[PDB]
Amino acid sequence: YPLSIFFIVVNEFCERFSYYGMRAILILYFTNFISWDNLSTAIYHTFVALCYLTPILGALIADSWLGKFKTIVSLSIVYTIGQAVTSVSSINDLTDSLPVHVVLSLIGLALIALGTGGIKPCVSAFGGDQFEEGQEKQRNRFFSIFYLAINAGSLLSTIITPMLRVQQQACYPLAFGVPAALMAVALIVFVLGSGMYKKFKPQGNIMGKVAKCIGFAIKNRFRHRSKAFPKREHWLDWAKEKYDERLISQIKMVTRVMFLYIPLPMFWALFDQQGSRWTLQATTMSGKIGALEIQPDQMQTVNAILIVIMVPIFDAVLYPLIAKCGFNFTSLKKMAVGMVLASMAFVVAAIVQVEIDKTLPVFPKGNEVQIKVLNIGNNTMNISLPGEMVTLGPMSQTNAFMTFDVNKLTRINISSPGSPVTAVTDDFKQGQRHTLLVWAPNHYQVVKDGLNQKPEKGENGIRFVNTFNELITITMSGKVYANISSYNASTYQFFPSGIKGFTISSTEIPPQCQPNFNTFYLEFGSAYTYIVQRKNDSCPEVKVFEDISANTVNMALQIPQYFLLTCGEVVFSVTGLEFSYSQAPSNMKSVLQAGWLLTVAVGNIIVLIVAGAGQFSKQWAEYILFAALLLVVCVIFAIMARFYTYINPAEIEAQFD
User: Fold this and answer.
1) Tell me, what DSSP letter sits at residue 66?
2) Using the 8-state DSSP alphabet, how is residue 234 labeled?
3) What's its membrane topology?
């Protein structure tokens, strides 16, 4: 048997790597039409439907018309041809009949749409078929190894993909060639193993027979409106009138198994919510391990890193250990446990989020308006605010922003010891942090900050304030602040972590002065304001003040929730697909796998429909999103599964004819 399984494993590995490393370049290239076209949105939304519908259109072809082997071969051939046509056409579109080549490229995309889906159920069913005579242990081993191989391909695509771009903007030839070459290699290596495989062909158009039988049965059931109309069994009482009992039993088994999958799409949609939330939580969790400098958005790879190790470990040790203590640990129990663990992952996440909430600042809401005062003069200033008065020495700042309401922010007065009083005439906008600058009794400035949230991706924001008489221009690590007027401040520009250097340029500064300066270690999530001041010899000098404190909590704290989520995903998915194959009848192994994939498709549709989030508070959002939905789904699924859906040994039940 191993000779018949190694080829399948390598083919799956290569195909998955190709698809994952191909999708990103696909979207990058199709962005040409997305922008060139809101007409493009309609096309995309109907196109994704083809990708979500191809699985059934492949399974139906495989089981009834051509068989699994022929379907795999043909679908792989067309998929490779699609990649090849996309690769060749993309060259003309970027070098140069342009609409013709664009149409050929779109036809290639459509062809790939078929291939991406046509292989998923058929290959799994073909792999499962190879085991016989009570080798269920080896079958489970194979299924676990197959699931591991899929994630290994995904991880390799994730790690390799970044190297590709702009390695040669016209690097598309390699981009669309390498996946095609790898898919061709996979197809050839799979085909060369034909001699050892085991294959079957259908007796006929089973799907058409099933459709006709179902129609006749439901019509007959709707007959006899006043003669034993209540069913003894929904189809045994009526379909039996004309059709063979074997087909009746097969459809009965398929319907019975499929009944269990009704709740699963909701679970999938709920589970998918973590992707766009935990990354942001990482953004606000930019604390760093002392050893290395992982970026906030790189945490997502931990899922694959954990799965590719968890999958072997369970089958290797855990299940034998659970069996030794005699727990009789069956499939339905495994799936329920997996979903429960998935639920617990989110409660751990909620605990971490509420722990984080301690050290974040508070930003204005609604009509609230916030102000920070910064004295940049040579002397002390006294400033009167609504219901408060503050004294600031030279080159000094208020520790934190003062919060007021737009209606109540009516009077502001500035004065210095023995100096005249100046009233503020500027206007403050609601929901915006404002910086107030004072350097003299009758000289001040109001600056809109713009920053009302933690910087995206944990980057550090920097801005400069000019105190020189003439304009100044600042360049720092590939970015430039140009033409800053006297006693004015520029907008924030975001930079990644690490130390950075910058140069100061201005006509007022004599050329012989020191041009360059360096900043301290910026860490993550922080924002700082720099003030440039004139020395005795006209040289510039730099001083720093803080605006938002650097982030505190270490980023390693996300590991527990990710570990729980990965365990729940594995122990659920592997057992789910194994059970799906196990209970399917002989004539329809592929259809039920296609139904399993449709289960994920429907969850994807549900998550897309719900779309943007609107929960009032993150702590409650992370909390309910399991405590009120996931456990309810789990209890519903357990109640449904309580009715002996596992009673059927599909392999031998049909022997009674």
Assistant:
1) I
2) T
3) Multi-pass membrane protein
- The span from the CA of 7 to the CA of 197, in Å, is 10
Asked, for residue 518, whether it belongs to a domain, the answer is yes
- Tokens in use for 415? 């004065």
Same domain, 615 and 505: no
CA distances (Å), origin 587, targets 72, 204, 246, 654: 17, 10, 11, 11
Q: Are 386 and 280 in a shared domain?
A: no
* Distance separating the N- and C-terminal Cα atoms of the chain: 30
Provide the H-helix boundaries in 193-244: 206-222, 236-239
Give CB contacts under 8 A, 24+ apart, made by 254-261.
254/584, 254/585, 254/588, 254/591, 254/592, 256/645, 256/648, 257/580, 257/583, 257/584, 257/592, 257/645, 257/648, 258/592, 258/595, 259/640, 259/645, 260/637, 260/640, 260/641, 260/645, 261/595, 261/596, 261/599
- Residue 263: partners with Cβ closer than 8 Å, 6 or more residues away: 633, 636, 637, 640
**Residue from 248, 343, 322, 244 nearest 637 by CA:** 343
395 and 353 in a single domain? The answer is no
Task: Answer whether residue 100 is part of any domain.
Answer: yes
Q: How far apart are CA 501 and CA 542, in angstroms?
A: 12
One domain for residues 317 and 428: no
Number of domains into which the chain is organized: 3
d(CA 235, CA 635): 29
**Deposited resolution, Å:** 3.9
Phi first, then psi, for residue 433 (nearest 5°) are: -75, 135
| Same domain for 328 and 450 | no
Alpha-carbon torsion 99, 100, 105, 107, what sign?
positive
For residue 568, is it within any domain? yes
Specify the 3-state DSSP secondary structure of 436. Answer: strand
Can you say whether the dihedral through the CA atoms of 320, 322, 327, 329 is positive or negative? negative
User: Do the domain assignments include residue 216?
Assistant: no
Q: Are strands 501-505 and 516-518 parallel, antiparallel or unpaired?
A: antiparallel
Residue 432's identity, in one-letter code, is Q
Instruction: Please state, in angstroms and rounded to a whole number, the distance separating the CA atoms of residues 283 and 353.
Output: 12
Q: How many residues does the chain have?
A: 657
Amino acid letter, residue 596? W
End position of a domain, from candidates 548, 576, 609: 548
Q: Give yes or no for a contact between 317 and 521, defined as CB atoms under 8 angstroms apart.
A: no
Collect all residues with Cβ–Cβ distance below 8 Å to 117 and sequence separation of at least 6.
51, 52, 53, 54, 55, 57, 58, 597
Q: Which two tokens stand for residue 467?
A: 């105190």
Same domain, 391 and 482: yes
Q: For residue 328, what are the domain limits? A: 261-286+296-360+554-646
Query: At 521, which CATH number?
Result: 2.60.40.2890
Does residue 5 sit in the same domain as residue 90? yes
The residues pairing with 545 across neighbouring beta strands, listed in sequence order, are 529
